[PDB]
Design an enzyme around this catalytic site. Structure first.
Site, short mmCIF file in Angstrom:
data_model
loop_
_atom_site.label_atom_id
_atom_site.label_comp_id
_atom_site.label_asym_id
_atom_site.label_seq_id
_atom_site.Cartn_x
_atom_site.Cartn_y
_atom_site.Cartn_z
N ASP A 154 -46.84 35.53 18.93
CA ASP A 154 -45.76 35.26 17.98
C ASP A 154 -44.76 36.40 17.79
O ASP A 154 -43.91 36.32 16.91
CB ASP A 154 -46.31 34.81 16.62
CG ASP A 154 -46.85 35.96 15.78
OD1 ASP A 154 -47.41 36.91 16.35
OD2 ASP A 154 -46.71 35.91 14.54
N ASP B 96 -49.16 44.33 14.00
CA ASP B 96 -50.00 44.72 12.86
C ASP B 96 -49.95 46.23 12.80
O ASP B 96 -50.12 46.89 13.82
CB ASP B 96 -51.43 44.26 13.07
CG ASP B 96 -51.53 42.75 13.19
OD1 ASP B 96 -50.85 42.06 12.41
OD2 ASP B 96 -52.28 42.26 14.06
N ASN C 298 -48.96 41.38 18.75
CA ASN C 298 -49.43 40.01 18.92
C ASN C 298 -48.41 39.31 19.82
O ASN C 298 -47.36 38.87 19.36
CB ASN C 298 -49.54 39.31 17.57
CG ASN C 298 -50.48 40.05 16.60
OD1 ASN C 298 -51.67 40.21 16.87
ND2 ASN C 298 -49.92 40.53 15.49
#
Length: 130
Positions: free
Chosen positions: A49, A53, A46
């Site tokens: 940020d 995952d 991601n």
């Protein structure tokens, strides 16, 4: 490892996921399907940020596992994120149980809300013998 539908269903039942904290097996199947396509080595970075995952349930490194490169992260499952990329899903199942112990429950995964919530999820476990 890419699990076959019924193979996974039976494995999750044996790990005690059916009805865990009120979550039916079919919901866990729907979640794994939309998060990784039943693939244990799935990873997703991601960029927004700086978190990643990991695994079959796409567990996030900011709160659940430690990968060392995620800023201001905690490791509530007390596991290296590496453990969530194994073919054996015992650790991923134990960490998933930890995630849903929080107030949000299964809702912690937005994918569950978009694709499983208020839907007929029976199809995920039909014919599997669970």
């Amino acid at each position: 490892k890419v699990f076959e539908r019924c193979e996974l269903a039976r494995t999750l039942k044996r790990l005690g996921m059916d009805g865990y904290r009120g979550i039916s097996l079919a919901n866990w199947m729907c979640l794994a399907k939309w998060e990784s396509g039943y693939n244990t080595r799935a990873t997703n970075y991601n960029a927004g940020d700086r978190s990643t995952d990991y695994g079959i349930f796409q567990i996030n490194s900011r709160y659940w596992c430690n990968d060392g490169k995620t800023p201001g992260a905690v490791n509530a499952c007390h596991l290296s994120c590496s453990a969530l990329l194994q073919d054996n899903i015992a650790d991923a199942a134990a960490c998933a149980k930890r995630v849903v112990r929080d107030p949000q429950g299964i809702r912690a995964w937005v994918a569950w809300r978009n694709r499983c919530q208020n839907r007929d999820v029976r199809q995920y476990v039909q014919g599997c013998g669970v």
